[PDB]
Design an enzyme around this catalytic site. Structure first.
Site, PDB file in Angstrom:
ATOM      1  N   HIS C  44      36.490  20.913  27.125  1.00 45.55           N
ATOM      2  CA  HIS C  44      37.949  20.745  27.208  1.00 45.55           C
ATOM      3  C   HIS C  44      38.419  19.426  26.620  1.00 45.55           C
ATOM      4  O   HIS C  44      39.626  19.202  26.468  1.00 45.55           O
ATOM      5  CB  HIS C  44      38.469  20.898  28.642  1.00 45.55           C
ATOM      6  CG  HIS C  44      38.319  19.665  29.475  1.00 45.55           C
ATOM      7  ND1 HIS C  44      37.280  19.486  30.365  1.00 45.55           N
ATOM      8  CD2 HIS C  44      39.087  18.552  29.566  1.00 45.55           C
ATOM      9  CE1 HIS C  44      37.405  18.308  30.954  1.00 45.55           C
ATOM     10  NE2 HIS C  44      38.490  17.721  30.481  1.00 45.55           N
ATOM     11  N   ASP C  91      32.300  24.807  30.310  1.00 47.60           N
ATOM     12  CA  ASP C  91      32.981  23.590  29.874  1.00 47.60           C
ATOM     13  C   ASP C  91      31.954  22.586  29.367  1.00 47.60           C
ATOM     14  O   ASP C  91      31.644  21.597  30.039  1.00 47.60           O
ATOM     15  CB  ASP C  91      33.815  22.987  31.005  1.00 47.60           C
ATOM     16  CG  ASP C  91      34.744  21.883  30.520  1.00 47.60           C
ATOM     17  OD1 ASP C  91      34.856  21.681  29.283  1.00 47.60           O
ATOM     18  OD2 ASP C  91      35.363  21.217  31.378  1.00 47.60           O
ATOM     19  N   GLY C 192      40.061  11.036  32.546  1.00 40.92           N
ATOM     20  CA  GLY C 192      39.474  10.019  31.693  1.00 40.92           C
ATOM     21  C   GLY C 192      37.966   9.906  31.883  1.00 40.92           C
ATOM     22  O   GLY C 192      37.253   9.290  31.061  1.00 40.92           O
ATOM     23  N   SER C 194      36.310  12.807  32.388  1.00 42.09           N
ATOM     24  CA  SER C 194      35.910  14.110  31.815  1.00 42.09           C
ATOM     25  C   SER C 194      34.889  13.998  30.702  1.00 42.09           C
ATOM     26  O   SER C 194      35.012  13.147  29.819  1.00 42.09           O
ATOM     27  CB  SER C 194      37.118  14.864  31.251  1.00 42.09           C
ATOM     28  OG  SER C 194      37.989  15.243  32.292  1.00 42.09           O
ATOM     29  N   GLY C 195      33.912  14.898  30.724  1.00 45.07           N
ATOM     30  CA  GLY C 195      32.879  14.927  29.716  1.00 45.07           C
ATOM     31  C   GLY C 195      31.740  13.952  29.962  1.00 45.07           C
ATOM     32  O   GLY C 195      30.672  14.072  29.358  1.00 45.07           O
TER      33      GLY C 195
HETATM   34  N1  LIG Z   1      38.101  14.907  40.407  1.00 46.15           N
HETATM   35  C1  LIG Z   1      37.418  15.703  39.388  1.00 46.15           C
HETATM   36  C2  LIG Z   1      38.299  15.607  38.135  1.00 46.15           C
HETATM   37  C3  LIG Z   1      37.838  14.854  36.974  1.00 46.15           C
HETATM   38  C4  LIG Z   1      38.655  14.749  35.809  1.00 46.15           C
HETATM   39  C5  LIG Z   1      39.927  15.350  35.816  1.00 46.15           C
HETATM   40  C6  LIG Z   1      40.402  16.107  36.993  1.00 46.15           C
HETATM   41  C7  LIG Z   1      39.592  16.222  38.134  1.00 46.15           C
HETATM   42  C8  LIG Z   1      41.805  16.559  36.649  1.00 46.15           C
HETATM   43  C9  LIG Z   1      41.611  18.079  36.366  1.00 46.15           C
HETATM   44  C10 LIG Z   1      42.980  18.794  36.278  1.00 46.15           C
HETATM   45  N2  LIG Z   1      43.940  18.290  37.253  1.00 46.15           N
HETATM   46  C11 LIG Z   1      44.349  19.143  38.354  1.00 46.15           C
HETATM   47  O1  LIG Z   1      44.708  18.686  39.385  1.00 46.15           O
HETATM   48  C12 LIG Z   1      44.091  20.618  38.322  1.00 46.15           C
HETATM   49  C13 LIG Z   1      44.105  21.518  37.235  1.00 46.15           C
HETATM   50  C14 LIG Z   1      43.810  22.811  37.754  1.00 46.15           C
HETATM   51  C15 LIG Z   1      43.647  22.649  39.146  1.00 46.15           C
HETATM   52  C16 LIG Z   1      43.314  23.668  40.199  1.00 46.15           C
HETATM   53  C17 LIG Z   1      43.069  24.376  41.087  1.00 46.15           C
HETATM   54  C18 LIG Z   1      42.766  25.227  42.285  1.00 46.15           C
HETATM   55  C19 LIG Z   1      42.114  26.452  42.109  1.00 46.15           C
HETATM   56  C20 LIG Z   1      41.847  27.236  43.241  1.00 46.15           C
HETATM   57  C21 LIG Z   1      42.240  26.787  44.520  1.00 46.15           C
HETATM   58  C22 LIG Z   1      42.903  25.552  44.679  1.00 46.15           C
HETATM   59  C23 LIG Z   1      43.171  24.758  43.551  1.00 46.15           C
HETATM   60  O2  LIG Z   1      43.822  21.311  39.489  1.00 46.15           O
HETATM   61  C24 LIG Z   1      44.108  16.847  37.476  1.00 46.15           C
HETATM   62  C25 LIG Z   1      42.747  16.276  37.851  1.00 46.15           C
HETATM   63  C26 LIG Z   1      42.176  15.771  35.421  1.00 46.15           C
HETATM   64  O3  LIG Z   1      40.937  15.471  34.773  1.00 46.15           O
END
Ligand SMILES: NCc1ccc2c(c1)C1(CCN(C(=O)c3ccc(C#Cc4ccccc4)o3)CC1)CO2
Ligand SMILES: NCc1ccc2c(c1)C1(CCN(C(=O)c3ccc(C#Cc4ccccc4)o3)CC1)CO2
Ligand SMILES: NCc1ccc2c(c1)C1(CCN(C(=O)c3ccc(C#Cc4ccccc4)o3)CC1)CO2
Ligand SMILES: NCc1ccc2c(c1)C1(CCN(C(=O)c3ccc(C#Cc4ccccc4)o3)CC1)CO2
Lengths: 242, 242, 242, 242
Positions: C44, C91, C192, C194-195
């Site tokens: 991603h 991913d 940030g 990620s990856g």
């Molecule tokens: N901390 C690791 C972590 C590491 C890097 C990173 C994230 C989390 C993000 C991922 C996307 N984002 C979100 O917040 C996000 C995108 C999609 C969902 C979801 C969901 C879900 C599915 C089923 C049940 C409940 C929730 O949450 C902000 C945090 C941003 O980049």
């Protein structure tokens, strides 16, 4: 700094960076070391509202911002009593460091101008700092110190430039006697350079002619940078600094 | 407007809104109809730089911004020649509409005060507008015209307050004779209210005492709102307006 | 990185930073050196949309982002063909560097796990990166590499945790077998990061267990960090990396 | 809505605005009235995380958002159990209004399609909403309800287009059977349209073909808007809605 480039490590040993406490000690203005225990800056950097000294640090000449900080505490902030806006004037202040700096080759004082000095239109002057590289464009990491040569423009000429495209009566003086104009449409200081030194070389000596103070935007047509004129405030400065 | 409430549809028939051309005709300043073809506003709303007349429009009294717009072109903009910053003063401008408006009972002029009127403390005064409802807090949709009663404060009393928490020397006058002070920490004008009317009820008649001009933030401690004093500029107003 | 602390200079020599061209070469994702000529990272970060190779560079282990960059061009971005969203999985991606890295003790490869290693709870594991230090909270300059010890948990508990406080049916698998979960309300990877690598010490050898992939916010109750399970993709990786 | 035009006041009597409690009751998604006591919307608008009912209101059809609000409380939020991400699918939800609505001329239900209707290309179809008018571009005050006529694209064609310029394998299905595709580079739904109706005129009756779900940006090349296919979930809807 608009235009110009990264400063060589050996240059501008008097440049300082003012830091404000927060999630990190963030740069908010420039200054110059004018004495081992005193830094000269702009009043609008630290005023007119009174702030807590615990929330302020000084950082001496550094090639890149933040990289190897040695933050210095300040014991007194002295703001010119006439100050409350940059446009009205008296935009000048002094910070007393808690301890004298042990002054060296890459960190030492800049020389203030003699009471006479004029700095005629078209002389070799440089302004330095870590400010924006254009209107609303931050200096990018790793935040190198920048320098740019700017042409002086004498006050009456500069004042008339400021009346172009404006409603202000031609008799209303915008550029004051305690100010000084420098820069053009390609070379200028900007937000975050405020309080830093405009220096000129005369007789082989760098003299601080101005403190970055204000202007209309950065490097805009008919809007040269405006600086606090140091000679105007010599007597006030020497009332506090040896 | 900070504190206060939505205005009744009957009240403030002279309130106007200034619009700048963009993705939509966005509200940027207030104003008041003081003559069927003239609008009194703040100079800092339209200056000191000269801007394009075609980029500007006036909207007359309207309960909710944008809802039922009927925008009016302006034929000329007259800014007081002494103006270039609100702190320096002369923060007052005039707009001539291309046409007179067909005066109504939902729209009509406010009365200018007699030169002798001082608007002393204790006088019942109201400021109105569609500006922010607190520092950095936008008026929410549907953007009702708000009003708030603000206590008037004598110039010299207001001057002292602006020295509290500030470096500025006691001998330096901040609140000038062409200014007037009103508001407290619960009731004040704000960004977006600029140019709009401060009106006081005097022996049955509403007079425009001031034009919203500046201040340190909105409803902050020891920082009353500062207005351009309309009496001060009657001769200048009368030179242009029938 | 949420929680934890600045990494010692001698640690995590396989950590890299991916940079996107712009006003400067800005960090946008982490990665890990898995072979002198191959970086492992998240799909991603570089897809699903194909972008210009020339707009990407790789920065090898630095203490501080930006300060002494030696940026490296990439010759191939290989994204797992099953990938289109992190929530679905696959991913994972590989960057081939134009030229091999000359490895040292401050820059060298991390070991991939054997297919058999499950990384059960109780295993000592760290995640490293230059990402946000909390939800909507950038890492402050001078941008030190950070590290945090995170607790591994089993997939079934991580899957069930994600159903907690959510509408999704309990029979719907959110956390899939090609993922691996770690972290808690005090220790997590974030935007940030990620990856970048999740590494565990097994038999006194550091093995890359995972690639930072997604999760809901950072360090939120019942939303642990989700990583791509590196063992799941060993075969794919080995089609390209010797 | 990217695009089209403001809707005539007589069109789309079933359109609703969903509002979340804050400084004002702010629009965040659209929906449609499919029964006097039930609203049809997208799952991602209200999940997958369970939020408090008290923080939600429904507003029935208004020509301009916020101007004549009559907010309606919700007593049940029902989210399809397969849902957790718009890209995986099952992006459909139901709101039960606390009280039934008294159907008017300007407010009435939209008809669901018979299971047999596939909505081939060439059918007259409109999507409606108060969402953004382009990528990162808000609908300007006074927030007129917009409509745009969108071209339906067959699933297999649309699925193929989503692979154009992406790394995703051809045999990986992005656009699923419970989705439907519509729009081009001049006509699309956008952020804030989510949850709102795609309707088609069939044999003299408006049928709701789709619920605005997702897409890569709005009106981008090879990336048509993705909708939840109503016919696919008739059974689930009829389990709740008389
Ligand atoms: N901390 C690791 C972590 C590491 C890097 C990173 C994230 C989390 C993000 C991922 C996307 N984002 C979100 O917040 C996000 C995108 C999609 C969902 C979801 C969901 C879900 C599915 C089923 C049940 C409940 C929730 O949450 C902000 C945090 C941003 O980049
Ligand atoms: N580049 C030096 C320069 C150096 C540092 C710096 C500025 C300018 C600022 C000063 C204030 N600012 C403004 O833009 C500003 C504040 C007040 C006026 C004005 C005026 C004016 C008066 C009469 C006639 C025409 C214009 O312009 C942004 C640029 C930001 O900090
Ligand atoms: N609420 C009326 C009020 C009404 C409208 C309005 C403001 C204040 C502004 C004025 C400018 N502004 C400021 O914040 C500002 C600009 C300059 C100063 C100052 C000062 C000062 C001078 C001497 C001593 C102490 C302080 O404060 C934001 C609030 C914005 O528009
Ligand atoms: N206009 C309908 C449309 C209507 C409403 C709306 C969107 C699109 C959003 C959807 C999410 N978003 C994104 O942009 C997005 C999120 C995930 C992807 C993707 C992808 C992809 C998958 C396979 C191959 C290529 C791309 O794109 C911005 C526009 C936000 O709200």
């Amino acid at each position: 700094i608009v235009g110009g480039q990264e400063a060589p490590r050996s240059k501008w040993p008097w440049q300082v960076s003012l830091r404000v406490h927060g999630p990190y000690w963030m740069h908010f203005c420039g200054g110059s070391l004018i004495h081992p225990q005193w830094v000269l800056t702009a009043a609008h950097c630290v005023g007119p509202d009174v702030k807590d000294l615990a929330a302020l640090r000084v950082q001496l000449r550094e090639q890149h911002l933040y990289y190897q900080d040695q933050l210095l505490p300040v014991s007194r902030i002295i703001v010119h009593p006439q100050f409350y806006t940059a446009q009205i004037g008296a935009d000048i202040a002094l910070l007393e460091l808690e301890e004298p700096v042990k002054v060296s080759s890459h960190v030492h004082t800049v020389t203030l101008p003699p009471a006479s000095e004029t700095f005629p239109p078209g002389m070799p002057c440089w302004v330095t700092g870590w400010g924006d590289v254009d209107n609303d464009e931050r200096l990018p990491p790793p935040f190198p110190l920048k320098q740019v040569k700017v042409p002086i423009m004498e006050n009456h000429i500069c004042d008339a430039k400021y009346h172009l495209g404006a409603y202000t009566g031609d008799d209303v003086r915008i550029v004051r006697d305690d100010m000084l104009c420098a820069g053009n449409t390609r070379r200028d200081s900007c937000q975050g350079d405020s309080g830093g030194p405009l220096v000129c070389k005369v007789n082989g000596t760098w003299l601080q002619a101005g403190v970055v103070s204000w202007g209309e935007g950065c490097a805009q047509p008919n809007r040269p940078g405006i600086y606090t004129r140091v000679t105007y405030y010599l007597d006030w400065i020497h009332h506090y600094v040896p």
